[model samples]
Target chain A: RKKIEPFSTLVILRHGESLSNLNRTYSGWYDTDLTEKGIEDAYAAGRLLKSHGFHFDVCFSSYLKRSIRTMWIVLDVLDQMHIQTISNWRLNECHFGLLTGMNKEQICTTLTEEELNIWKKDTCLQPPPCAPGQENPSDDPKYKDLDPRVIPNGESIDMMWERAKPYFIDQIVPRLMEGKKVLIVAHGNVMRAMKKYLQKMLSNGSALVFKFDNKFNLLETEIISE
Target chain B: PFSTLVILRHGESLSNLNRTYSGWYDTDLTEKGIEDAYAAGRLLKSHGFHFDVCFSSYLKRSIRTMWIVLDVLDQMHIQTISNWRLNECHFGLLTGMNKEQICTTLTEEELNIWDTCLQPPPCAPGQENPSDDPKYKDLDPRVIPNGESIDMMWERAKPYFIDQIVPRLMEGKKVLIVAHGNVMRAMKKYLQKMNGSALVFKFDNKFNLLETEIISEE
Candidate 1:
């Protein structure tokens, strides 16, 4: 029999819908629990992976509840709850600053179309920073151990990428190099940033898998929906 | 007024139903075990129990039970740490052997202290050590017991409780520990010298045990 080459598998997923998503607000670093539909979606994601015979050796998630909870549900569904999991601040969503908790439509009315487009589409332009009196992410107990300088009041997509890249290289890449299956559950923008990086690396290759949902950039497999 | 701590023995496992010594054998929960876990979660939810974090043994039975309970409580996001210290007592040559069958070999005096005895059971030829298991790889082989008496189990478990868990309790953060039968028994003994609805416990800010209760399904 011929020897088979060892390879790594990576699955990256955005957390399911949250209360902020239902309200059409910028959630960013703000902590929010998953909605009922979100919880169901998470279960479905797990079932889809299980049906495909996917199993992970290690999992990663943001410190946020939404992301962590999704990871929990997926692991439970896969019947691999004992697998090691690491939750880190580096995987958190792009900090939205003053924009957090504000209604999307309200922001649209306030900013000029050009200004809004830049905020939405620009990878390097940061939105307005959170004022002194606003809820500061550094003040949150979860981030208490982190260096305050690393905590952002607002971050451009590129800025978010810079922070996450180190974690991907330091913590994740070594595992994948060992042919370990990996799973990452995080927020939308962070997912985008990681996907962009993954695509760039492949242009130079794990069998990186993305969610089957239309909103995400689908890769080799599509997530099965119930 | 202080912190709330919940400790639970994992739901029944396949070995439990067969009346075999599980030790570090790694058994999965039986159907009744799964049902009891769900029932325990529902009962805790009804009582408005919420936890800030959870701890469990590395074994699947304990981990799965904790997962189900956390799912029911809608607190799956909370941090969970699994440690080998919380693992079930190692039964050495007794591992996987039926208790009734073993009874035929030992005298009444030996059988009476079978579980609590400080001395370990005799090792049959080629019996594997705990360090031989993949799960205990990170642990120093010497620290991993080949066969653990109740006291031996407590020697390892008590330090983890004092170092890792007690600080959280002192901080007034609610904590949950889903572990094995002997581990819990050892903990109970230590706490009495000191200190849930599947068994619930309350501790004052200083980590003094205030009360305990069992929340069972009707």
Candidate 2:
């Protein structure tokens, strides 16, 4: 008799290009629509996944439109639109606070190169808090249910990881442990946080595909892209 | 003090354009149908309507309409529950037949009661059965119908609506439902009995009918 191995596949994808990406501005939790190119890229990603015979039982996306729309398009292409799709705020981009919409070039001009490098490289460095009148994620109606303490006005990469890691372990891990195929459409920093966490746990690392065996041990990692 | 319930009929499908009976035949939406879905979403947004969850039939036409509407409302993140109970009345041997031809065969009175009549139309030898479809395989074969009258469709839908949807509405969660014409009519009749109707009905938490209107784009 042959024994069947219990394994699961998890795919994490950053949302396609958004208006903020095209403008070279930090989006943070700011809601932005996908550009036409972004829409095309999403379609392409869907087609690529379909070509590889990938089918998902569930999908996860951030509350933001760009990520949600990308996941929707990908699911449509996969003809798996009816699958359970969960949208959670934990998967949101790191809140940039006062720097939420600032252009990178303008920020470079304002700060010294060393200071900029430190901001870029430091996992623990928080951005300036939002100005009094600026909108906060907590103030948004979409996040009205969240605890104000957990909703940040600004956050470090480490601060984001603190939230993202728990969501991964609590909500997503159990499903994978049950041998379910899961797809997550999120943001760049969120992806980095997850990737870094996985790398620290014996992960060798496009949609970043992680294969886990019966015991939930990481088996292999692959990047699927154009 | 009102928890909103908005019921939307799916936009024009290919069968609608061809003047044919689709039922469980599974037809895609026409381009005009897609536009209608988008228009419905825009209209709902303009009215300040936001949903906690959405419900639709397992069929593609209804599911696609719900998807497009959610996209237009920028509420793609919300969960959409697709149920076989919400599917169109299965037309059995009548599926894919021209409506005009059927009209010519039956009397005016018979035609009027054609959909609402409790007696199901005859099943064909080669007709596709809902039980055989992978989407409904988990369900007991007895629950899956070879043919269904509007009343029969309601028998299935009303229970699901009561068990799954009404509780959410009672909890003050705004709800949206996109489905087929006959099933929509069945729901409308039941809802009218509760509030005593229309393309869309806005209901209070107690099931009192508040408003009714048809949505379209010029």
TM-scores of all predicted structures: 0.48, 0.50
lDDT of 1 at B199: 65
Clashes of each: 3, 0
lDDT of 1 by residue, B1-218 (tens): 58887788878899889888788888899999998788878888998988999999988999999999999899999999998878888877677778686687567877777757655564567865544666654342224577778887776676567556776877788888987887887777666664034567788754667877766665
lDDT tens readout by residue for model 2, A1-226: 6534338888888788899989999888899889999998889889878977788999999889999999999999999999999998878888888888889776787568887888888788778888898766556778654433347778888888766765676567768877899999978888877877666642111578888776667777878776
Worst 10 residues of 2 chain B by lDDT: B194-203
RMSD vs true structure, all candidates: 17.5, 19.5
Which regions of candidate 2 deviate over 4 angstroms?
A1-6, A201-205, B1-218
DockQ for all models, in order?
A: 0.01, 0.01
Pairs in steric clash, model 2:
none
lDDT of 2 at B103: 74
Q: Return the lDDT, model 2, position B38.
A: 80
**Alpha carbon lDDT of residue B147, candidate 2?**
71
TM-score of chain B of each: 0.91, 0.86
